Design a binder for this molecule. Structure first.
Ligand SMILES: Nc1ncnc2c1ncn2[C@@H]1O[C@H](COP(=O)(O)OP(=O)(O)NP(=O)(O)O)[C@@H](O)[C@H]1O
Ligand SMILES: Nc1ncnc2c1ncn2[C@@H]1O[C@H](COP(=O)(O)OP(=O)(O)NP(=O)(O)O)[C@@H](O)[C@H]1O
Ligand SMILES: [Ca+2]
Ligand SMILES: [Ca+2]
Lengths: 291, 293
């Protein structure tokens, strides 16, 4: 089985042929910005032309949310002119092969799951801690996507009812205390201002104020993991993203989790398949669906 | 298809034959307490004898957690001498029909799900707010039970990192803020003391302090529901239990939910299938499993 894999980001669109889990014929173009909706139809037509005849099926990872083949988001304004873009339908204009679509964090989850021991790990969660917090959830070896592609938005679960307000209005979500954006909202008000990377450097040098800020984030992620373990019987959590992978961060997450009662514990590890995670994860998931 | 359905509670064991969702041949006995483990083996022998020949399969609802056919609990204290009791193996000594096991809140979830429109509702959560807070979760029309029977323990998810400590050790759980026990922990300290039922009566008369206590619980349940909607794409939540069904309670829950952004909203209704929920839910679920493999 040969997969035409597409990874549609906010800035770049990567395409490739994936066969036996191997990438070949990479290609990267800019995500349409001018007249984006009209342009995207052209871009997709051109990609499907370039690889014509070379694929048995198409797998699309995209930022945002895939709702019944349509590209959307919690705030569809963050997509600009691609809000509500009919993604599956436009691809289907140019091919009769089956097309699967999922979002980018879901695809990254599948990239980190595909090489797990699936006898031993059937309930699995990928959390990216980056500019924001996103997730992908796999239960009984299957990724959650139904009915509307929302499952996995665990960055919008509650971290503290007295915490900061999150982007779209919920008071106290994980995103507003744990994400890189939430770290910077505090560190940029320091005299003088610091970025999250600078706050981390100070944390690793035992700066107590920087440490408190990084702990605020790590503690929120630890409590989210505990919620997933006790709520869903999750067995393993893989953490990625530039904050999630920062030196010292995951060890702090695990220290907070370990001081909870042992039945909140699970395997917690850093992401190790970030390279081409969207492409490889989408190809694996769509092939798995085909069974 | 004929189901021998058992509902093993803290104090009573109910049994019955369930055929096409109809109950017949009820028996109800006391849950063994003296020499519980030894006695339970006898009780199960006796029940399977009484019903011998009358069932194609066995469905068991039990309090606590079913881990690979064994009765356990987050803290095995509240199981007494039935802690780690080999429930499936013990029943299998007396029958070769198939035996399915699930916990009591999971069974109540299935009782409330079985008459939903399965086309329109595939992700469904049942929450019982009573002495404690329990849940049962159904995703893509299937109850979550693997691998170790823990799925659905949403009373132990976080409500407030500065809230009270939960019974089994976690700081700030939903249960320690929302359950009947948590309400009474505060209202028993009033001068003079009140039970939760009395606190609710005062809340309905607009006592601001009692109202504050009830809102603490309702807001915590509303935030849990919001977590389930955004985290799991849950479409419908059904709320039961003596606190959950108390007059005024669910409207308050829904009022808190409705002030959040629209994408946290879902259908929220009161439980309506509480009667024989254990028996009927277990019977339906085990049949559903058998149909699908
Ligand atoms: N080495 C680093 N250590 C800690 N935080 C970092 C580091 N690098 C970047 N960040 C922060 O992590 C967040 C995203 O970083 P970055 O990866 O550079 O942006 P991006 O990749 O374009 N967006 P995203 O898809 O979320 O990763 C921001 O809050 C950064 O300040
Ligand atoms: N009408 C009521 N309104 C509000 N709270 C109530 C009411 N009745 C009982 N409660 C409280 O809810 C909890 C359980 O009440 P009750 O149902 O009588 O015991 P139970 O049957 O053992 N419940 P449970 O074991 O949790 O399924 C206790 O906290 C009660 O104080
Ligand atoms: Ca929000
Ligand atoms: Ca606990």
């Amino acid at each position: 089985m040969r997969c035409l894999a597409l990874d549609i980001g906010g800035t770049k669109i990567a395409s490739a042929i994936v066969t036996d889990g191997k990438i070949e014929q990479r290609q990267q173009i800019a995500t349409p910005q001018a007249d984006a909706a009209n342009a995207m139809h052209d871009t997709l037509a051109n990609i499907l032309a370039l690889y014509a005849g070379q694929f048995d099926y198409v797998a699309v990872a995209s930022t945002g949310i895939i709702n019944h083949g349509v590209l959307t988001a919690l705030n569809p304004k963050n997509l600009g002119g691609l809000a509500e873009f009919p993604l599956k339908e436009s691809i289907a204009r140019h091919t009769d092969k089956p097309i699967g679509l999922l979002n980018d964090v879901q695809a990254a989850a599948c990239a980190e799951y595909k090489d797990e021991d699936k006898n031993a790990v059937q309930n699995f969660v990928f959390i990216t801690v980056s500019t924001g917090v996103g997730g992908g959830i796999i239960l009984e070896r299957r990724l959650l996507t139904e009915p509307n592609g929302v499952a996995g938005h665990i960055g919008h679960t509650l971290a503290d009812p007295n915490g900061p307000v999150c982007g779209c209005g919920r008071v106290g979500c994980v995103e507003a205390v744990a994400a890189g954006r939430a770290i910077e909202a505090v560190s940029s008000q320091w005299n003088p201002p610091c970025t999250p990377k600078q706050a981390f450097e100070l944390f690793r040098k035992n700066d107590e104020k920087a440490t408190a800020l990084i702990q605020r984030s790590a503690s929120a992620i630890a409590n989210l993991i505990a919620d997933l373990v006790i709520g869903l019987d999750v067995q393993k959590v893989v953490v990625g993203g530039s904050v999630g992978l920062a030196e010292g961060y995951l060890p702090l997450v695990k220290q907070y989790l370990n001081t909870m009662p042992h039945f909140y514990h699970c395997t917690v590890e850093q992401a190790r398949h970030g390279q081409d995670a969207g492409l490889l994860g989408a190809a694996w998931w769509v092939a798995d669906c085909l069974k």
